Amino acid sequence: AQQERDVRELVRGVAGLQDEADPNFQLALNFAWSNFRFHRFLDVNSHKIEKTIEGIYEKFVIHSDLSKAASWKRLTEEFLNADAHYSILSLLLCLS
């Protein structure tokens, strides 16, 4: 129920279509849902996400961006304490 509202807001927000009575709104929505229901990915692997996070930290350190490395480690450590943790992180990694 709130899912359906969320997907509509996602379309409005990301695609910039604020008028649900625009045929382009409904076309974007049908596409979003059809995309969501076409199961085609493996489930999120937490260990692989953790390796990537730690890889981002190394890259910051390698380039001597100390205030970004310390921030990166601090934020991800804090977040990873209270499955959805890794799903959220995977999405952000995919949008990087």
Binding site: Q2, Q3, D6, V7, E9, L10, V11, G13, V14, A15, G16, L17, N24, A28, F31, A32, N35, F36, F38, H39, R40, F41, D43, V44, I56, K68, S71, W72, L75, T76, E78, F79, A84, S87, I88, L89, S90, L91, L92, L93, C94, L95, S96
Partner: protein, 61 residues
Amino acid sequence: AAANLNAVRETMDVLLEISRILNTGLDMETLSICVRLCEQGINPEALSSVIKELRKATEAL
């Protein structure tokens, strides 16, 4: 209690900063949408796919 909304406020702000370091382009409003969808079990790679195409075809409109 009233102490759960400040907790959620703290995590959402951690997440937005993580999102900014990664340069995802998300605002706090759409980031909150994404969190709820992930918690409800939408596949994150499906959601990434949807978001990237809804962007690819809006500057084009």
